[PDB]
């Protein structure tokens, strides 16, 4: 480490996130198809437990998992797993689409016919305040 702050592991909820890891990194080096089953299981349980201060960090790997692994279907799951308990305004999640259009985007040069499975169904439910524009 660069910085002189200390390496204090204050491990809040994420610390899930922190021991299960290195299990996967036995598990993803080898399969990674049965490590999917753990890692994104977590996102799952941290959401609805409102544990989803773990939640946070899983979120930007399930487009590494998910998507990869042939899963690009519940990456349109994930845009919606914070969404479902409240109404909420759009662009405040909408930071999420940014793993849509990371590697989901692109998944093994991810083809329009099948990605349209997860952007349209997608479109339909963030067009609530639409893509375009921003906090205007």
Same mark, same amino acid.
């Given at each position: 480490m660069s910085r002189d702050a200390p390496i204090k592991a204050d491990k809040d909820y994420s610390q899930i996130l922190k021991e299960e890891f290195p299990k996967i990194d036995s598990l993803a080096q080898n399969d990674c198809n049965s490590a999917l089953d753990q890692l994104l299981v977590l996102e799952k349980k941290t959401r609805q437990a409102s544990d989803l201060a773990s939640s946070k960090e899983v979120l930007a790997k399930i487009v590494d998992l998910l998507a990869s692994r042939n %899963?690009? =279907? =519940?990456?349109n799951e994930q845009l919606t797993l914070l969404s479902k308990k409240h109404g909420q305004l759009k662009l405040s999640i909408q930071y999420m689409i940014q793993k849509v259009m990371?590697? @989901? %985007?692109?998944? %093994?040069? @991810? =083809?329009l016919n099948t990605r349209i499975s997860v952007i349209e169904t997608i479109r339909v439910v963030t067009e609530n305040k639409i893509f375009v524009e921003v906090e205007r």
């Open positions: %899963k690009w =279907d =519940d990456l990371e590697y @989901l %985007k692109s998944s %093994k040069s @991810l =083809d």
